[PDB]
Amino acid sequence: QLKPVDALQCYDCHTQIEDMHVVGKHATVNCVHCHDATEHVETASARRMGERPVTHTSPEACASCHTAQFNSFASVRHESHPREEKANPRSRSPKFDTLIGAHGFSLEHAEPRSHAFMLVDHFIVDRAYGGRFQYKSWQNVTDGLGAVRGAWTVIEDMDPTTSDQRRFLAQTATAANPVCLNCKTQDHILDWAYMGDEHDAAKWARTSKVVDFARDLHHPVNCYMCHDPHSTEPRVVRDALIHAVVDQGLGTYPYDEAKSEHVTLTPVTFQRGGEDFRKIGLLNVADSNLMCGQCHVEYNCNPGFQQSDGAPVGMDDRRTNHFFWANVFDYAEAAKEIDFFDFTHVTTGAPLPKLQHPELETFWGSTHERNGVTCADCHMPRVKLENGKEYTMHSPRTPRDMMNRACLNCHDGWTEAEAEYAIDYIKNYTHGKIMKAEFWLARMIDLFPVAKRAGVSEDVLNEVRALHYDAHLHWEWWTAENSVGFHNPDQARESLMKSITKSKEGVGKLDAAIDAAVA
Amino acid sequence: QLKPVDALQCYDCHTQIEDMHVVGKHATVNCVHCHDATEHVETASARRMGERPVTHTSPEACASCHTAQFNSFASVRHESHPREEKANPRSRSPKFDTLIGAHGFSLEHAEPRSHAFMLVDHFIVDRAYGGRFQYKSWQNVTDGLGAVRGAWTVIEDMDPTTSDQRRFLAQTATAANPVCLNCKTQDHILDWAYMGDEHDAAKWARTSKVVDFARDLHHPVNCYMCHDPHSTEPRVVRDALIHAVVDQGLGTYPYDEAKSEHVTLTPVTFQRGGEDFRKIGLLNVADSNLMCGQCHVEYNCNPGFQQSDGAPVGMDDRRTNHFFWANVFDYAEAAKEIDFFDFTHVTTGAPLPKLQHPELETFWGSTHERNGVTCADCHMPRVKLENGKEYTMHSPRTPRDMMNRACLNCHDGWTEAEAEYAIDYIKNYTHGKIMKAEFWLARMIDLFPVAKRAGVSEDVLNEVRALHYDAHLHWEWWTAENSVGFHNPDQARESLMKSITKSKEGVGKLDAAIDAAVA
Amino acid sequence: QLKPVDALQCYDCHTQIEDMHVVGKHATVNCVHCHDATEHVETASARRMGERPVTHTSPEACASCHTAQFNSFASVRHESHPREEKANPRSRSPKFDTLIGAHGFSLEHAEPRSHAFMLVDHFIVDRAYGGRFQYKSWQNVTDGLGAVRGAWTVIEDMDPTTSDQRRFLAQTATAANPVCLNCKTQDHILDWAYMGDEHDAAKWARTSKVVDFARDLHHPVNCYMCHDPHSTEPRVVRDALIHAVVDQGLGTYPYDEAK
Ligand code: HEC
Ligand code: HEC
Ligand code: HEC
Ligand code: HEC
Ligand code: HEC
Ligand code: HEC
Ligand code: HEC
Ligand code: HEC
Ligand code: HEC
Ligand code: HEC
Ligand code: HEC
Ligand code: HEC
Ligand code: HEC
Ligand code: HEC
Ligand SMILES: O=S([O-])[O-]
Ligand SMILES: O=S([O-])[O-]
Ligand SMILES: [Ca+2]
Ligand SMILES: [Ca+2]
Ligand SMILES: [Co+2]
Ligand SMILES: [Co+2]
Ligand SMILES: [Co+2]
Ligand SMILES: [Co+2]
Ligand SMILES: [Co+2]
C-alpha cells in the first residue's frame, strides 16, 4: 500500500502547490495519493522536470477517502435511453437528416446518457472515429463503473497498428479532433497547453493526431475538473471557459455584471521551463453553473470556415477551441466576431452554424437563474438521509428522479405530480414548436433544389441562404439544448417562433421565384 | 366420453405410426384422443382409405393431459400492442408507405402479437382477404382462448355465398393465398401435399381458392407443429423448411456444417395410394431454432416475377412456397438462384424483394446462436416453481417479461434493469439506423419522378434501380425482422449502413442526372 | 482546517505506534485526524508525557474519509421495534416477571434496536441509572445520527449536581456499573486499565462511580472497536474477550482447536 512522501521536499520547488495545499482541506492529504514522484524527486531541478512523475487521474484515486461521491459519480441511470438517435420520430429532431444535410452529426447524434459513459460514448459514436473504437462487447454498454475506471477496459481499437482517422464502417465519420476531449476527460490536463496551442511542453495539442491522443485517455469528467486536488477549492479547468470569462473579460455571467462580480474565476497559471503552459480558474464559491458550463455550452471544437471569404479554419487556429459565451439572440453576432461558420448546407449552399448543447447560455436570464439557482440544484442535489452525512450526488440527471430535493424543496405548495406536469407542459409546448420549425425549415430546404433547377437567380438563392442561417440557428439551438425548453421556456418560444418566421419567409421567396421562373 | 380403440387393429395397416407410437412417450395414449376412425376401420383397405377418419387438430385435443402447456399456449400478452401499424411514427417503419409503394403490405402491416391470434390476424388483416373476414365484435380482440378453439368462433365471413377474393372495404388487398396458411395453422396437414403441389390426395394446394381454404381452417400454430403426436418427438412439419434443409441439402444451420451435423432433420414421408404425399422432419434434439424457423423466416408465399425476363411466377410454381434459407448478405444471390423478385416499385420501376421477418437467418452467426442459444431460451423458457414440475411455457414473448429465466440465468452479474438496458441500447442504436436508411431510401425514391420528368436517361434510371434493390433489401430486412437488431446487432449495423450507402449513391446519381438534364 | 503534524517527530517517542502506523493502510493518514498533540509535543520527553494529548474518539473522526461506512453505522432500522419490553405477550418472555423475580431486569428489559442507540439506551433504560438519564425529548428517539455524535446531545441528566446512583422514578433500578460501558462505547479506551483494574493511569475502573463515568462517555460502539486506528488491521479491544481467549487459555473458538 501507499507510503507518504516528504511533502516539504516537494514544496521547496513547488511553491504554488504548497500555497494551495497547506491552506485547504487537503492539507493532511499526502501527494502519494495522486502522484508517484520518486524518480522525479531524484532527477528534477528548480527548473527541469527530470523524470516525469506519475499523476493518478482516475476518479478512483479519490475513492479511498470519498467513496460516497465516487460511487454516485460512477452510477448509471438506466432510464436515460441509451444510444438513442435524435434523427428519429421518437426523439428530438425527426427531420434532422434534412436539416443538417452532410454534416458529421448526420452519421449519428444520440441523446445524452449518464456521465460515466461520456468518454467511451465520444470514442465510439459513429460520427467520431470512423467506427475505429467499439465496445469490446454489447454487454459492456451497462458498465458505468468500468467506463469510469478506463475507457479501454470496455472498448477496443479495431486497428491498433495505424493512427490515421478513417472509416472502418461505411456510415461513420471522423469528426473527432483533440479539442473534443476537453469536454470528456481531463486526463490530459498536464499534457495540453492552455487552448490546445502547440507548445514544447504539450504532448497533445489542437493539431495532434486524434487517434493517438484518444489512446492516451481513460477516464470521464475527472473529479478535479470541478475541485482543485491540492486545495479542494471549487474551480474550472476548461481552457476555452477561462478564455471567455477571464481573458476576454466577459465575466462568469456575461449578461449580469453584478452577478459576475459576485461569482469569480481567479486564474492560476502553471509554467513549464518558465513559460506559461496551463491554467485553472479558481471559483470563489462553488457555483455549479460554471462547473457544468465547462461542457454544457455552445462551442467550436472543430474546423470551420470564414464568413468573410469562405476560407477554411483548421485546427491550428484558436477559433477551433472557442466558447461563444452568448445567448441564442447574440450568437450570430458572436460567430461574426470570430468570422466563423461551421458548414455549408449541402442542399441549400447556405453557410450555417452548428449548435451543440447550449444549456448554460439558455439557462442565463431564466427565472431560475435569476433567482440564483444552479444546475446542480436540479440535477445534482445532496442526498437526503435520516441518519447520515448528506453528501452531494455526483452523477447529474433529471430532477424527475429526485423531485423532493430538486423542485419540491423550493416549491412546497406542489406535489410531485404537479411539478412534473409543469415540466411536461413546457417540454410539450417547446417540442411542438421545434416540430414546426423543422417542418418549415425542411420545406425551405427541400425547395432549394426546385428553385435551382427552375433557374431561380443567385440573388434570390443568396437571400434565402441568409434566411437559412437564422432559421437554422433558431431551430438547432433547441434540439441541441437538452431541456426541450425547460431551461428557458420564453426564450425557446421566441427563438423557435423566429426560426419559423425566417423559414416561412424563405419558403415564400423560393415559391415566388420558382413561380416566376417557370412562367 | 372417450372409449379407447384397438390400436393393434390400426397398427396392421399403419406400420409407420406403430413404429413411432409404440416406442415413444405416447405409447399408452390411445388413438381416440386424436382420431375418430370407426367408419374408417370398417371401410379401409391396405391401400384405400375408405371413409376418412376424423383427426382432431385442435390444440385442445392435447389439453386433457397437457393443460399447463395448453393454457400457456392460449395466453395473451396484453402488453404486446395489438393491431399496431408499422407505417407509423410510433412503430417500426414511419416511411413504409413511400418505401413499399403499391405493395399489398401498404394496405396494412401490423406488428406481431401473441401466437393465439395468428390465424385470426391472418384472416382479418386488411391486406389479406379484401376485408372479407372480420372479428364478429371488437370485444373479441382479447379472446386468445377463443381464437385457439377456432377462428370462426370469433370471426365471421362478410359473404359466405361467394368464394372469390375481392375487396369488401375500399383500402384492403387480397394478398392471401394458400401458402400463407402454412405459417398460421397445420389443420390442413393431411389435406396438403408436400410443398402445396397439386395432388390427387390433396383437397388444398398452392393453386386453391384461398377463401375456400380459409373456411376449412380453425386453429393457430397447432401443437403437433413441433411435436410428433405419435412418438412425442420434436419435429418440424413445414414443407418449405424440410425442402431447404433436407431436399436441397442446405442443413439445419446452413452456415455451420458441424452444427448441421449435430442438429438434424430426419424426413418421414407418408403416402396416399402409394405415392408420396406429405413429409415431416423429425428432430434429433428439441432445437427450437428449427421449430420456430418453421415460420420466423424469410420466404416466398406469394406470386412474383422473374429477374431474367420479368415473367410472372404464379402459385403453380414451387417458388411461391420457398424458404430462402440465407442471411441478409446472401439473400440477393439466393433470390437470383430462383430467378425471382416480388414486386416492381410503383415509383422507381425497380424490381424489389419483399422481406418478411427473417428472425432465424438474422439469429445465425450471432453471439447467442454461436453459443448454442435457441429462440425458446429467451422467448419460451420453463416456468419457475418453488414446488411444482416446471413445464415449458408455450406462448412465446419478449424476454422482458421473464428476465430472470431469459437473460439473468446466463448473465448472473447483471440486474434486470441492466439486461433491459443492454437490450434497449441495441434496439435504439438499430432503430436509429433504420430511420436513416428510411430517410435516404425515401429521398432516393422521391427523386425518381423528378429524374423521369426531367428526362434523365433509362441508363441512369436503370443503374439507380439496381441500387434500389440492395438499398431496399438492406433496409427492409430490419423492419421486417422484429428484434430491432437485438438478434444480430453487428449484422444489422453493417447491413443498414449498406442500405444507406446504396441510397446515398442512388440519390447522388439522380441529383447529378437531373442537374445535367435541366442544364 | 486541520494542519498535519510531523509524524516522524511523534515516532521518536512512539515506536509502538510507528510500527503499526507505517506498515498499514493508514500510513498516509496524519495523526492530526485523531489527536491534538501540540502542547503534548511542546512539553513531553520520551520519559514524561507532559501535557496529555487529546484523542478524538468520535466515529465522526473517521467520516471525513469513510463517510459511507459512517453513514451506514449511524443508520436506524425503523422496523426494529424500539423500547419494546420483553416481559410481554407480544415479545420474548411473557412470564419474565415471575421467572426473574426481583432482579434488576424486572424493571425493564427491552428488545435490542439499532447500534446507533446502544450507549443512549444503556443510559436511559429503567434498570440502569434509576431514571437519572432521559431523552431531552421523546422526539429524540429517532435520532441515530445525534446519538452517534454524542449521547449528551440527545439525552440529559435529571440532577447534574449529584453523582450518586439513586431512583428518580419509582419503578427504576440502578444496575449500571462501569463494566457495562465496555459493551456500549470505548471512548474510555485510554482511561481504563485492562479488565477495569484500579491502576494509577486509569481515570476509570470497575469500582468507579458509574454516574461520573457515564458523564465522560459519548459515542456508541466506536469505529476503533474492530479496526486498529493506526494499522487499520482487524482487532478486538474488549478486555474480557482478550481475557477469555488469551488469559483463560480458551482460544478464539474454544470448541474448535484447529479453528
Ligand atoms: C484521503 C487520503 C483523501 C483523498 C485521497 C482525497 N480526499 Fe478529498 N478530502 C479528504 C479530507 C480528510 C477532507 C476534509 C473533510 C472535511 O470536511 O474536513 C477532504 C475534502 C475534500 C473536498 C471538500 C472541501 C469542502 O469544501 O468541503 C473535496 C471537494 C475533495 N476533498 C475532493 C477530492 C478529490 C476530487 C479527490 C481526488 C482528486 C480527493 N478529494 C481525494 C481526504 C481525501
Ligand atoms: C464541451 C464544450 C464539449 C465539446 C468540446 C464536445 N462535447 Fe460532446 N458533449 C458535450 C455535452 C455537454 C454533451 C451532452 C449533451 C448532448 O448534446 O448530448 C455531449 C455529448 C456528446 C456525445 C453523446 C451524445 C451523442 O451526440 O451521441 C457524444 C458522442 C459526443 N458528445 C461527441 C463529441 C465529439 C465527437 C466532439 C468533438 C467533435 C465533442 N463531443 C466535443 C460537450 C462537449
Ligand atoms: C463538476 C461537474 C464536479 C465533478 C467533476 C466532481 N464534483 Fe464533487 N462536487 C461538485 C459540486 C457542485 C459539489 C457541491 C458543492 C457545494 O458546495 O454545494 C461537490 C461536492 C463534493 C465534495 C464535498 C462533500 C459533498 O458535498 O459531497 C466532495 C468530497 C467531492 N465533491 C468529491 C468529488 C469526487 C470524489 C469527484 C470524482 C468522483 C467529484 N467530486 C467530481 C461538483 C463536482
Ligand atoms: C464535461 C467534462 C462535462 C461536465 C463538466 C458536465 N457535463 Fe453533463 N454531460 C457531459 C457529457 C459529454 C454528457 C453526455 C454523456 C454521454 O455519454 O452521453 C453529459 C450528460 C449529462 C446529463 C444527461 C444525464 C442522463 O442521465 O442522460 C445531465 C443531466 C448533465 N450532463 C448535467 C450536468 C451537470 C448538472 C453538470 C454540472 C454539475 C455537468 N453535467 C457537468 C459533459 C459534462
Ligand atoms: C431546475 C430549475 C433546473 C435547472 C437549474 C437546470 N435544469 Fe437542466 N433540466 C431541468 C428539467 C426539468 C429538465 C428536463 C428533464 C426531464 O426529465 O424532463 C432538464 C434537462 C436537462 C438535461 C437533459 C436531461 C434529461 O432529459 O435526461 C441536461 C443535460 C440539463 N438539463 C443540463 C443542465 C445544465 C447544464 C444546467 C446548468 C446550466 C441545468 N440543467 C440547470 C431542470 C433544471
Ligand atoms: C393423455 C391421454 C395425453 C394426450 C391427449 C396427449 N398427451 Fe402428450 N403425453 C402424455 C403422457 C402420459 C406423456 C408422458 C409423460 C412423461 O413425461 O412420461 C406425454 C408426453 C408428451 C410430450 C413429452 C415427451 C418428452 O420428451 O418429455 C409431448 C411433447 C407431448 N406429450 C405432446 C402432446 C401433444 C402435442 C398432444 C396433443 C397432440 C398430446 N401430447 C396429447 C399424455 C397425453
Ligand atoms: C411463414 C414462413 C409465414 C408465411 C408463409 C406467412 N407468414 Fe404471416 N407471419 C409470420 C410470422 C413469423 C409473423 C410474425 C412476424 C411479423 O412480421 O409480424 C407473421 C405475421 C403475420 C401477421 C400479423 C402482423 C401483420 O403483418 O399485420 C399477419 C396479418 C400475417 N402474417 C399475414 C400473412 C399473409 C397475408 C401471408 C400470405 C401472403 C402470410 N402471413 C404468410 C410467418 C409467416
Ligand atoms: C413449437 C413452436 C411448439 C409448439 C407449437 C408446441 N410446443 Fe410444446 N414444446 C416446445 C418446446 C421448445 C418445448 C421444450 C422442449 C425441450 O426439450 O426443452 C416443449 C415442450 C412440451 C412438453 C414437455 C413438457 C414441457 O417442457 O412443458 C409438452 C407436454 C408439450 N410441449 C406440449 C405441447 C402442447 C400441448 C402444445 C399445444 C398446446 C405444444 N406443445 C405446442 C415447442 C412447441
Ligand atoms: C408458425 C406456425 C409459427 C411458429 C412455429 C412460431 N411462430 Fe412466433 N409467431 C408467428 C406468427 C404468425 C406471429 C404473429 C401473430 C399475430 O397474430 O400477430 C408470431 C408472433 C411471435 C412473437 C410476438 C409475440 C408477441 O407478444 O407480440 C414472438 C416473440 C414469437 N412469435 C416467437 C416465436 C418463437 C420463440 C417460436 C418457437 C418457440 C415461434 N414464434 C414459433 C408464427 C409462428
Ligand atoms: C436471447 C439471446 C434471444 C434469442 C435467443 C432470441 N430472441 Fe427474439 N428477441 C430478443 C429480444 C431482447 C427481443 C426484443 C424484445 C423486447 O422486448 O425489446 C426479441 C424480439 C423478438 C421478437 C419480437 C418480440 C417483441 O418485441 O415483442 C420476435 C418475433 C423474436 N424475437 C423471435 C425470435 C426468434 C424466432 C428466435 C429464434 C430464431 C429468437 N427470437 C431468439 C431476444 C432473443
Ligand atoms: C484515527 C484514524 C487515528 C490516527 C490517524 C492516529 N491515531 Fe493514535 N490513537 C487513535 C485512537 C482511537 C487511540 C485510542 C487507543 C486505540 O487503540 O484505539 C489512539 C491511541 C494512541 C496512542 C496511545 C497508545 C497507548 O499507549 O495506549 C498513541 C501514543 C498514539 N495514538 C499516537 C498516534 C500517532 C503518533 C499518530 C500519527 C502517526 C496517530 N496516533 C494517528 C486514533 C488515531
Ligand atoms: C483520511 C484522512 C482517513 C481517515 C480520517 C480515516 N481513514 Fe481509514 N483509510 C484511509 C485510507 C486512504 C485507507 C486506505 C484505503 C485503500 O484504498 O487502501 C483507509 C483504510 C481503512 C481501513 C481498511 C483497510 C483495508 O483493509 O482495506 C479501515 C478499516 C479504516 N481505514 C478505518 C478507519 C477508521 C476506523 C477511522 C476512524 C478512526 C479511519 N479509518 C479514519 C483514510 C482515512
Ligand atoms: C458492543 C460495542 C457491540 C458490538 C461490538 C456489537 N454489538 Fe450488536 N448490539 C450491541 C448492543 C448494545 C445492541 C442493542 C442496541 C440498543 O440500543 O438496543 C446491539 C444490537 C444489535 C442488533 C439488533 C439491531 C436491530 O435492528 O435491532 C444486531 C443485529 C446486532 N447488534 C448484531 C451485531 C453484529 C453482527 C456485530 C458484529 C458486526 C455486532 N452486533 C457487534 C452491542 C454491540
Ligand atoms: C457486553 C458483554 C455487554 C455488557 C457488559 C452489557 N451489555 Fe447491554 N447489551 C449487550 C448486547 C449485545 C445487547 C443487545 C442484545 C440484547 O439482549 O438486547 C445489549 C442490550 C442492552 C440494552 C438494550 C435492550 C434492553 O435491555 O433494554 C440495554 C438498555 C443494556 N444493554 C444495558 C446494559 C446495562 C445496564 C449493562 C450493565 C449492567 C450492560 N448493558 C452491559 C452487550 C452488553
Ligand atoms: O458533440 S458534442 O458537443 O455533443
Ligand atoms: O406476412 S407474414 O409473413 O407476416
Ligand atoms: Ca458549435
Ligand atoms: Ca419474402
Ligand atoms: Co427516448
Ligand atoms: Co448532442
Ligand atoms: Co407499440
Ligand atoms: Co410483419
Ligand atoms: Co416487536
Nearest Cα residue to atom 3 of ligand 2: A183
Measure the CA–CA gap between A176 and C180, rounded to whole angstroms.
67
The secondary structure of B149-213 as a DSSP string is H-HHHHEEES-TT--S---SSTT------GGGGGGT--TTTTSB-GGG---TT-SB-TTS-HHHH
**A94, A88 Cβ separation under 8 angstroms:** yes
- Note whether A295 and A392 are same-domain residues: yes
- Note whether A374 and A287 are same-domain residues: yes
Measure the CA–CA gap between B364 and B498, rounded to whole angstroms.
19
Elucidation method: X-ray
- Using a CB–CB cutoff of 8 Å, tell me whether C74 touches chain A: yes
- Note whether A271 and A342 are same-domain residues: yes
Measure the CA–CA gap between C184 and C122, rounded to whole angstroms.
7
Type and span of the H or E element at A275:
strand A275-283
- Note whether B121 and B254 are same-domain residues: yes
In chain A, the largest separation of any two C-alpha atoms, in whole Å, equals 88
State whether C75 and A386 contact (CB < 8 Å): yes
- Chains touching B by CB (3 or more pairs below 8 Å): A
**B91, B84 Cβ separation under 8 angstroms:** yes
Q: What phi and psi, each to the nearest 5 degrees, are found at residue B323? A: -105, 120
State whether A27 and C33 contact (CB < 8 Å): no
Measure the CA–CA gap between A44 and A40, rounded to whole angstroms.
5
Cβ–Cβ contacts within 10 Å for residue A6, how many?
12
Measure the CA–CA gap between A322 and A320, rounded to whole angstroms.
6
**B447, B345 Cβ separation under 8 angstroms:** no
Nearest Cα residue to atom 27 of ligand 7: B110
Measure the CA–CA gap between C199 and C192, rounded to whole angstroms.
8
The partner residues of A276 in beta bridges, in order of sequence, read A271
- Note whether B5 and B135 are same-domain residues: no
- Ligand 3: centre distance to CA A99 (Å): 39
Residue type, B323: F
- Note whether B219 and B333 are same-domain residues: yes
Dihedral of alpha carbons B418, B419, B422, B426, sign:
negative
- Identify the CATH number of the domain in which residue B40 sits: 1.10.287.3080
- Note whether B400 and B418 are same-domain residues: no
The secondary structure of C217-254 as a DSSP string is ---SS-GGGTB-TTT--B----HHHHIIIIIT---SST
**If you search the block for the grid coordinates 453557410, which residue do you land on?**
A351
Residues of A in contact with C30 (CB under 8 A): 28
Measure the CA–CA gap between B238 and B325, rounded to whole angstroms.
13
Residue type, B207: T
Closest CA to A461 of A419, A498, A517, A509: A509
**B134, B124 Cβ separation under 8 angstroms:** yes
Type and span of the H or E element at A35:
strand A35-36
Measure the CA–CA gap between A457 and A453, rounded to whole angstroms.
10
CA atoms in the 13 A half-sphere facing the CB of A22 = 11
Closest by Cβ to C3, choosing from A27, A65, A67: A27
CA A82-A85-A86 angle, to 5 degrees, is 120
Kindly give the interhelix angle for A458-480 and A489-518, rounded to the nearest 10 degrees. Answer: 160
Residue A130: which residues within 8 A CB-CB, separation 6 or more?
A165, A166, A167, A168, A169, A172, A173, A174
Of the three residues A19, A42, A58, the one that is the final residue of a domain is A58
Interface test with A, best of B84, B429, B496 (most A CBs within 10 A): B429
Question: Which residues sit with Cβ closer than 5 angstroms to ligand 21, an ion?
Answer: B 81, 84
**Environment class of A167 (CB within 10 Å of its CB; exposed 0-12, middle 13-18, buried 19+):** middle
State whether A87 and B417 contact (CB < 8 Å): no
Question: Looking at chain B, which residue has its C-alpha nearest residue A170?
Answer: B497
Residues of A in contact with B419 (CB under 8 A): 142
- Identify the CATH number of the domain in which residue A73 sits: 1.10.1130.10
B399 CB within 6 A, ligand 10:
yes
- Identify the CATH number of the domain in which residue A475 sits: 1.20.140.10
- Using a CB–CB cutoff of 8 Å, tell me whether A15 touches chain C: no
The secondary structure of C106-141 as a DSSP string is GT--BPP--GGGHHHHHHHSTTTSTT-EEES-GGGG
**Environment class of C237 (CB within 10 Å of its CB; exposed 0-12, middle 13-18, buried 19+):** middle
- Note whether A155 and A88 are same-domain residues: yes
Exposure string (b/e) for A21-55, b if CB count within 10 Å is 16 or more? bbeeebbbbbbbbbbebeebbeebeeeeeeeebeb
- Using a CB–CB cutoff of 8 Å, tell me whether C145 touches chain A: yes
- Note whether A225 and A268 are same-domain residues: yes
Q: What phi and psi, each to the nearest 5 degrees, are found at residue B278? A: -135, 160
For every residue of B25-85, which 3-state class applies, written as one string?
CCCCCCHHHCEECHHHHHHCCCCCCCCCCEECCCHHHHCCCCHHHHHHHHCCCCCCCCCCE
- Ligand 2: centre distance to CA A124 (Å): 12
Query: What is the stated resolution of the deposited model, in angstroms?
Result: 2.0
Measure the CA–CA gap between A19 and A12, rounded to whole angstroms.
11
Interface test with C, best of A387, A389, A392, A394 (most C CBs within 10 A): A387
Question: Looking at chain B, which residue has its C-alpha nearest residue A139?
Answer: B422
Q: What phi and psi, each to the nearest 5 degrees, are found at residue C151? A: -50, -45
B residues 92-111 lying closer than 8 A (beta carbon) to A: 94
Taking the CA of B374 as reference, the closest ligand is 10
- Note whether B446 and B505 are same-domain residues: yes
State whether C65 and A64 contact (CB < 8 Å): yes
- Going by beta carbons, is chain B in contact with chain C, meaning 3 or more pairs sit under 8 Å apart? no
Contacts 24+ apart (CB under 8 A), B20-23: B20/B228, B20/B230, B20/B231, B20/B233, B21/B230, B21/B231, B23/B231
Question: Looking at chain A, which residue has its C-alpha nearest residue B517?
Answer: A453
State whether B422 and A138 contact (CB < 8 Å): yes
Nearest Cα residue to atom 21 of ligand 3: A392
A356 CB within 6 A, ligand 15:
yes
State whether B421 and A141 contact (CB < 8 Å): yes
State whether C66 and A71 contact (CB < 8 Å): no
State whether A87 and B421 contact (CB < 8 Å): no
Domain hosting C19: range is: 1-58
- Ligand 17: centre distance to CA A392 (Å): 31
C106 CB within 6 A, ligand 13:
no
Q: What phi and psi, each to the nearest 5 degrees, are found at residue B161? A: -85, -10
Q: Which of B295, B300, B356, B361 to mutate to test the pocket of ligand 16 (most atoms within 8 A of CB)?
A: B356
Strands A155-157 and C35-36: unpaired
The partner residues of B282 in beta bridges, in order of sequence, read B235, B266
Mapped onto helix, strand or coil, the DSSP state of residue C176 is coil
Of the three residues B387, B413, B439, the one that is the final residue of a domain is B413
C33 CB within 6 A, ligand 11:
yes
Measure the CA–CA gap between A267 and A276, rounded to whole angstroms.
12
Kindly give the interhelix angle for B458-480 and B489-518, rounded to the nearest 10 degrees. Answer: 160
**B168, B140 Cβ separation under 8 angstroms:** no
Indicate the number of domains in chain A: 3
Mapped onto helix, strand or coil, the DSSP state of residue A320 is helix
**A101, A78 Cβ separation under 8 angstroms:** no
Closest CA to A183 of A254, A234, A112, A231: A112
- Note whether A203 and A275 are same-domain residues: yes
